[PDB]
Design a protein around this ligand. Structure first.
Ligand code: MG
Ligand code: MG
Ligand code: MG
Ligand code: MG
Ligand code: MG
Ligand code: MG
Ligand code: MG
Ligand code: MG
Ligand code: MG
Ligand code: MG
Ligand code: MG
Ligand code: MG
Ligand code: MG
Ligand code: MG
Ligand code: MG
Ligand code: MG
Ligand code: MG
Ligand code: MG
Ligand code: MG
Ligand code: MG
Ligand code: MG
Ligand code: MG
Ligand code: MG
Ligand code: MG
Ligand code: MG
Ligand code: MG
Ligand code: MG
Ligand code: MG
Lengths: 131, 139, 135
RNA sequence: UAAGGAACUCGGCAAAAUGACCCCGUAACUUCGGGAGAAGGGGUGCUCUUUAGGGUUAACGCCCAGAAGAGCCGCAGUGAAUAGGCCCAAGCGACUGUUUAUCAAAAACACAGGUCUCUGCUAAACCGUAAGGUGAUGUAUAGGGGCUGACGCCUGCCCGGU
RNA sequence: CUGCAUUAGCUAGUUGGUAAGGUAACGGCUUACCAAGGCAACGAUGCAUAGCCGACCUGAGAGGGUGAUCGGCCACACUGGAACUGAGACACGGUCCAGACUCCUACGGGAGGCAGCAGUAGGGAAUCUUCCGCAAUGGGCGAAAGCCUGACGGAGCAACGCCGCGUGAGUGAUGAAGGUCUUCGGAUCGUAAAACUCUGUUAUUAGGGAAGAACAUAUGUGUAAGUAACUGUGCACAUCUUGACGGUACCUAAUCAGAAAGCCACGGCUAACUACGUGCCAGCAGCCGCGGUAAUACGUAGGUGGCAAGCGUUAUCCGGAAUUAUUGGGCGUAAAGCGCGCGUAGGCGGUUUUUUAAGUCUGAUGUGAAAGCCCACGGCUCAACCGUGGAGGGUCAUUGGAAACUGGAAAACUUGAGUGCAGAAGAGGAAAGUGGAAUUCCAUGUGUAGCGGUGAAAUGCGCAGAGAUAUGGAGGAACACCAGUGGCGAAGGCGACUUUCUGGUCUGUAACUGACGCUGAUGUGCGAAAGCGUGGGGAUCAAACAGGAUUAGAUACCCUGGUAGUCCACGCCGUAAACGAUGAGUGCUAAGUGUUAGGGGGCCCCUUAGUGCUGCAGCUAACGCAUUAAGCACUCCGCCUGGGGAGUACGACCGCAAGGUUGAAACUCAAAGGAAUUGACGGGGACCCGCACAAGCGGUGGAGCAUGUGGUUUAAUUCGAAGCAACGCGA
RNA sequence: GUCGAAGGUGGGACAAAUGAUUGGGGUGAAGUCGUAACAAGGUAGCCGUAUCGGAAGGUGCGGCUGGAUCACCUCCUU
RNA sequence: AAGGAGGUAAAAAUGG
């Protein structure tokens, strides 16, 4: 059965991006919503909507494409997994694409990006890479 | 025979000790021969090898490598036909064997006229003769 | 495999075999046993000396000796160079390196060591055949 | 019965040795029952002290029966008598049985098992001249005869001759 | 902080308690008593191997390999046991006992332990002097001088390693001789050489000549505690004296280019090519390979390349090897998905709220010796080397903080998972019963000479009446049409009909429970056919087998028979190309068109679950897969790591047996493999054409003769041509 | 007197070496016999199982397509 | 009209 909702969400985003879809609806959760908000703030997606219905709610992402129809999201990679969880220190925080990408992290100070983790000098569980 | 290496080492050491005692291997007979100044010398050396070097050895008269020869001359023929199965083979030769002058050694002559035996096979015939003579015919 | 599978059964590397097993063994006579020790060469006594025919497509009468080594292991060792002065009971030094033509010949007899003589008339690459500098 | 210990002899024939009870311990192989008392070891008398019990009785008493400790004596304590020698292998017969009363006990017979064959009942087979019987007060999962001989794995070719 | 399960059970002072004894000390450390505890799949026990570390080698790293020299810790001192003395030993150059071995002896009896430094013998491919001195540092004793110190400081030997410097430098065309090649002009060795000039690092000779040396002691004073006061004691300042190395390092002066270059390689990888000799020989070779007369691959020579007091070879380790893949690989066809269920441990797990701080993150403190590696600086003329600082190295510990995620605790939700309610189809399974067609056999009527079979035949059956035909009977086995990329089942599998018992699945609904789920090692069951046991049954077909045929032979294919078996019951076996060669669960990602079983809204549309075909994105070595993924992802399991050897051997477990499961190695090769391409080929195919058939005229084959050929004969019958495409052919 | 090394006796366990003889395996040169597989390989091949035969292999039962193929019907795709 | 899936006939000497 389902074992990694975050991986499912990332794969939904990847598949929609490949097929060049405009919107993407998935079941919601707080971690997923925070991930989507980070993506929007960083500019990888266009908009995020939350539908506060029954059954845990729905997230409705809107993907972003640049000029020439180029895809803003090149790739998403799950880093920490149920089968093996990954943590890093503040001084060991990895840079995605030499800084051109973001590493979504989960920290005592909320789920943030690797840039914010380095700035605040904190580590945590490296949820994902996005570039 | 398990003490042959010990025997060789003892022979080496004994030759270093005693210039007049010699040990050598004879190719033809494959025997190791010990040479000395006399029966007493060799007996003392044999006992010393047996006891000091703990290699019990037995000694005897050296073997004499005999030879064979033909006393009578004769013209002979050798034919070999093996066409019956699979690859077929054919060979034929007529050779006159003559008692050579003693000490002159083997002598092969090629009195072939008309190319009855192709010149390619003549060296092979000579080599076959050499091998068959290396192998004894009487003893 | 899953990470759990690797934790349960870790990965296992292939084991490497020596090309010259006979050189990896010494012998203790007092305890009458073998011992694991890597030697670059071993002394031996030529049990036999003669010629072998190479496997196809090569053709020759390649000179070799059957040698019993100081550790009591019997091997076939090639005799390199042109002409040699080796017979049965000769004491020779044996190093690694097989002869590809010769199936069961997995070692070489060093030239210019112990009984084995240097190659007569050799002038180029002499150190490989134990020949002194002519000068 | 000194020393020896199978050197005897066709052959250890005879003899010697083992032998009871308790405790420890016990191999190959096996049809899983066994082999097994395998083997190989230890203990064993008497006195006293302390002390768990069982049967029968109101109880006393009577009977059975252990454990621990400390002592004593001898060359020796199942102090006599009675009471397995053991082991490793091979042939044969599976086995318990049976046999030449009176020179043969066995590898011979028998055997449970196998197979072939006869027999539809007034059966076939058997005894008898017959009557009359056995078979059987049975009925083919039965009855007679031949051969084989537990069990395991198997049982090839020839129907010309008789 | 190590390998093995082809090691699964281990433990009886064993685990705990009580009492005592014992020890520097706590303690089953030991004994007495009571209890039955203790360890172990988080790997006990057993077996094998091993001194551990700082560090060292390698690698970009992650890792892999190693544990010399130097430092720390441990253990041992011919082997085993014991205690004595002592602060300390159960003691390398102590004791006692036992043991092995060895030695001396006057035969009465005695002695010894180099894994201390040298050295001997032996083993080995292989590792040094039976050297000098306590002058320096350190140690024991002494008040001290001092004695002892094979620690140590030195010297001797070894290219064993690293580092440094040599073997000369400038000019030198007149391209000198001579070697090698040549196109016979020349090219090359070559500014190389010769010659002139220069230098002395090195070397020889002769002189000077350190540091390492602080001291201790002794002799002079000064000062400080104490003294009633000295001698003394501590401290401070001066003086005599102390070197194995060693007359060594180093410096100076003179003489000479004179004494001082070798090794490997030159086919590709890989820098460097020509001539002779050889001729699959001799020989080379790390792989691919080279060598049979034109060898850049064998040997020599010239030249060239790489290195250089070293250069090559062998051995071993890491790398390249992403070739065990955490970083960083795979399993449709290349090696790889268990034949399939059911299910234990474990791994993993849906949404929200509160709480905890085990993981997770962050700060402080202590420690991670020294040496080493790295960075910097300083000293040897440089460098190696030496010295001094810095930096690094913990999965380390104590302590203070954060709460997002994982973990724990509490409380809710219905989306997953089940249940209820209403419906659907089904060769799902088990047991009894009924039925038609057909085959074989038996009996009888009619009937005559064949039947059967094959490419063609024969065996065989039949004149005793076969085969054919009609009727009846006996018995076994399978269910024609329906029938379908159709249905059902986890897989194997399930097809006449009827009855009974029974499993699963799908559709809609939204009462109901509230995460109860997924996977699944070990385990436990099912599992085509053949096969095994017992008892039945026996038509057909048919291993074995017999005969006939074919054939060179034919232990076959073909024909005639024919036993096991094929069927049933109950047990056993447990394997198949048990296949979709594709593990299970879950979600997500264009479309078109069928079909099975349903549902909803108007023949149409929508929809659920299957079953097919076609086809995007994406994937793939390609073939191909593609909402029934081989795409994109997460969880769990099984499996792979070149081909043989080999699914073999050994061990173990299972089986009546046959065999099954688990499962190596030595050795051997440089391939083995996959997909696709072009050819060629096929006792593969389709089509098209041709005096190839067909239509037709005339011939040859028959006769005589001409001629050529084969055969035979001869002294010779010359040689050549042999299917078409030899034969009135060379002629 | 307790403990106690070595020793002795006994039946077992495990490991190594060695052994008349024996079994398959690998390699090797033009050896001998046949021709199983690759084309429909001249009987499609292969898988499991049973049995037979000098040998490859043949034969039986079930399975697979990783099988060529002339005529027929039955469907599906463009 | 051309391709994919199932069933199913008839034929057959031997060696290249
Ligand atoms: Mg007597
Ligand atoms: Mg007596
Ligand atoms: Mg006797
Ligand atoms: Mg006698
Ligand atoms: Mg008797
Ligand atoms: Mg009997
Ligand atoms: Mg009698
Ligand atoms: Mg009698
Ligand atoms: Mg009998
Ligand atoms: Mg018989
Ligand atoms: Mg050791
Ligand atoms: Mg690497
Ligand atoms: Mg001492
Ligand atoms: Mg000593
Ligand atoms: Mg020493
Ligand atoms: Mg030596
Ligand atoms: Mg690696
Ligand atoms: Mg495969
Ligand atoms: Mg499968
Ligand atoms: Mg340090
Ligand atoms: Mg069956
Ligand atoms: Mg037949
Ligand atoms: Mg299988
Ligand atoms: Mg499979
Ligand atoms: Mg569908
Ligand atoms: Mg064939
Ligand atoms: Mg075939
Ligand atoms: Mg047959």
């Amino acid at each position: 059965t389902m074992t990694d909702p975050i991986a499912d969400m990332l794969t939904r985003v990847r598949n929609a991006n490949m097929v060049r879809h405009e919107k993407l609806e998935l079941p919601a959760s707080n971690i997923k919503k925070e991930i989507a908000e980070i993506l929007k703030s960083e500019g990888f997606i266009k908009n995020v909507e939350y539908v506060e219905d029954d059954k845990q709610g729905v997230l409705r992402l809107f993907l972003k494409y640049g000029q020439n129809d180029e895809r803003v999201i090149t790739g998403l990679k799950r880093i920490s997994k149920p089968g093996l969880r990954v943590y890093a220190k503040a001084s060991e925080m990895p840079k995605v694409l030499n800084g051109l990408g973001i590493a979504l992290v989960s920290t005592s100070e909320g789920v943030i990006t690797d840039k914010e983790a380095r700035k605040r000098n904190v580590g945590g569980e490296i949820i994902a890479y996005v570039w | 025979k398990a003490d042959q290496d010990k025997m060789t080492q003892a022979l080496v050491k004994l030759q270093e000790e005693d210039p007049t005692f010699h040990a050598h291997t004879d190719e033809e007979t494959g025997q190791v021969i010990i040479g000395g100044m006399g029966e007493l010398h060799l007996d003392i050396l044999v006992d010393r090898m047996k006891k000091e070097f703990n290699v019990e050895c037995n000694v005897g008269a050296p073997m004499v490598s005999y030879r064979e020869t033909f006393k009578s001359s004769a013209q002979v023929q050798g034919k070999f036909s093996r066409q019956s199965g699979g690859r077929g083979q054919y060979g034929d030769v007529h050779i006159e064997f003559t008692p050579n002058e003693t000490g002159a050694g083997f002598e092969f002559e090629n009195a072939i006229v008309g190319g009855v035996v192709p010149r390619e096979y003549i060296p092979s015939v000579e080599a076959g003769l050499k091998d068959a003579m290396e192998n004894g015919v009487l003893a | 495999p899953t990470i759990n599978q690797l934790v349960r059964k870790p990965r296992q590397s292939k084991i490497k075999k020596s090309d010259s097993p006979a050189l990896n063994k010494g012998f203790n006579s007092k305890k009458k046993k073998f011992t694991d020790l890597n030697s670059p060469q071993k002394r031996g006594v030529c049990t036999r000396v003669g010629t072998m025919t190479p496997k196809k497509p090569n053709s020759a009468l390649r000179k070799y000796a059957r040698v019993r080594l100081s550790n009591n292991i019997e091997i076939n060792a090639y005799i390199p160079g042109i002409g040699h002065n080796l017979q049965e009971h000769s004491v020779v030094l044996v190093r690694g390196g097989r002869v590809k033509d010769l199936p069961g010949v997995r070692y070489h007899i060093v030239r210019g060591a112990l009984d084995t003589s240097g190659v007569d008339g050799r002038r180029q690459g002499r150190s490989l055949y134990g020949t002194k500098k002519p000068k």
